[PDB]
Amino acid sequence: MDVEAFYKISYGLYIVTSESNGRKCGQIANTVFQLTSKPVQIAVCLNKENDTHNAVKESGAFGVSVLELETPMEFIGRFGFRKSSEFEKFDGVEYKTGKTGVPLVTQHAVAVIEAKVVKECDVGTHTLFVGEAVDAEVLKDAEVLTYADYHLMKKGKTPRT
Amino acid sequence: MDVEAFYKISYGLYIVTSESNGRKCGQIANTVFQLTSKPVQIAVCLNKENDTHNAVKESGAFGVSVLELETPMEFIGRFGFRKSSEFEKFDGVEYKTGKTGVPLVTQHAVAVIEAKVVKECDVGTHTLFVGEAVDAEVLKDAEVLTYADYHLMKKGKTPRTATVYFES
Ligand SMILES: Cc1cc2nc3c(=O)[nH]c(=O)nc-3n(C[C@H](O)[C@H](O)[C@H](O)COP(=O)(O)O)c2cc1C
Numbered sequence: 001m002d003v004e005a006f007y008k009i010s011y012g013l014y015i016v017t018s019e020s021n022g023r024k025c026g027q028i029a030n031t032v033f034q035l036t037s038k039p040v041q042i043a044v045c046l047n048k049e050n051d052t053h054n055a056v057k058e059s060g061a062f063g064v065s066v067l068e069l070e071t072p073m074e075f076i077g078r079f080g081f082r083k084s085s086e087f088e089k090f091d092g093v094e095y096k097t098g099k100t101g102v103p104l105v106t107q108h109a110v111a112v113i114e115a116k117v118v119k120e121c122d123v124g125t126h127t128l129f130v131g132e133a134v135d136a137e138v139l140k141d142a143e144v145l146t147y148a149d150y151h152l153m154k155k156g157k158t159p160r161t
Numbered sequence: 162m163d164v165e166a167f168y169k170i171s172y173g174l175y176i177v178t179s180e181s182n183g184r185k186c187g188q189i190a191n192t193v194f195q196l197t198s199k200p201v202q203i204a205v206c207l208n209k210e211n212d213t214h215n216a217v218k219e220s221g222a223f224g225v226s227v228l229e230l231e232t233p234m235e236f237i238g239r240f241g242f243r244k245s246s247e248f249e250k251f252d253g254v255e256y257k258t259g260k261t262g263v264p265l266v267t268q269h270a271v272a273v274i275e276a277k278v279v280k281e282c283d284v285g286t287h288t289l290f291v292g293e294a295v296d297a298e299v300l301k302d303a304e305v306l307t308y309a310d311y312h313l314m315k316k317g318k319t320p321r322t323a324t325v326y327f328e329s
Contacts, residue, residue, distance in 0.1 A: 001201075001294060001295070001296050001297045001298075002297050002298050002299055003201075003297070004272075004299050005227075005272040005273070005274055005297035005298055005299050006195050006201060006203075006274070006294070006297060008173075008227045008271050008272040008299070008305055009173055009193060009194060009195055009203075009227065010171060010172060010173030010305060010307050010308075011171060011173075011194065012169075012170055012171030031194055031195070031196065032170065033170060033172065033192055033194055033206070034167050034170055034192075035192065035206050035284050035287060035289060036206075036284055036285055036286050036287050037286075038285070038286055040162075040164075040167065041284055041285070042167075042170075043289070045194070045196045045197075045204075066166075066169040066170065069325070110169050111165075111166040111169040112166070113166055113167070119282070119284065121280065121282040121289070121291070123196050123197055123202055123280065123291055124197055124199075124202070125197050125198075125199055126196055126197050128196060128204070128282065128289070128291075130282070130284055130289075133162060133167075134162070135162050136162045136163050136164070136166035136167060137163055137166060138163055138165050138166050138169070143324070143325060144169055144171060146171050146307070147171075148305075149325070149327075152327045156329055157327035157328065157329055158327065158328060158329070159325065159326070159327060160326045160327070160328050
């Protein structure tokens with residue numbers, strides 16, 4: 001089995017957020033997808049070790065920010081390479097509070113979606129959360145950042161507009 | 162709630178295959194994603210009304226072909242008919258059969274993955290099947306076809322490659 005074959009699967013890049021006990025949590029995720037349209041349900045697959053996973057488990061709600069093509073690498077690192085309980089990820093970033101109570105990061109977001117958890121599917125090291133969308137808004141006309149794009153960024157390339 | 166926000170979510174384009182009662186099945190899908198790495202698990206979300214959904218439900222296995230950027234629209238069309246025979250779908254298509262029994266379509270595929278179902282997540286109109294990967298191979302050096310690409314091309318527009326440029 002060649003692990004490189006899995007590298008061929010396509011994804012977007014997002015910030016997944018939640019709040020529990022007054023503590024805001026957010027993390028980068030590429031595993032975010034719509035599952036159904038009746039009603040609209042979105043899935044996010046979060047590692048059980050993550051602070052954001054536990055906030056979603058406790059609060060039953062999550063937000064999703066779809067990152068723009070020009071999102072800086074330091075902004076992705078702010079959310080994707082440290083824990084929410086150990087570094088104040090939201091201090092210094094623009095965001096608002098959704099109807100569900102989750103923080104919705106608007107900085108560098110082409111769109112934001114908030115959902116309430118209607119099902120949890122335990123897949124071992126991660127929990128796949130199924131959320132029914134409660135609100136969604138398009139914020140910018142910008143191109144979205146794909147996971148493949150981010151990998152070109154890792155290799156040093158930079159988007160040009 | 163603006164529906165356009167959901168169109169900002171990114172997907173690939175794939176053929177999901179299975180076999181039931183000695184009959185090969187396959188459908189185009191955009192909702193295929195890796196869930197975990199230890200062990201490697203892949204999820205595919207299929208509509209309950211599709212024959213492939215029922216084949217996966219009965220057999221407990223599925224295959225995924227990751228389509229290349231230049232896949233002919235006619236080829237994608239073969240696997241998108243809610244009504245067609247097993248012959249109409251696979252006649253003249255290059256494929257092989259894995260140990261799990263599913264047909265792995267290699268034609269126009271950058272890679273193929275074979276998985277055994279280890280969990281089913283019922284989400285109403287669809288079922289999300291969680292499969293443990295049992296084999297996987299890269300078949301071509303080609304670029305992959307994304308769902309957004311397919312949409313632009315289908316209409317007639319120019320693929321993303323026309324506006325997004327990466328310089329060092
Ligand atoms: C490009 C990228 C993609 C990631 N994708 C996922 C993902 O889909 N699911 C996940 O649980 N973690 C993913 N991570 C890891 C989390 O962002 C990371 O572990 C983060 O530190 C968790 O923060 P938290 O503990 O505050 O929730 C990704 C990280 C990066 C940089």
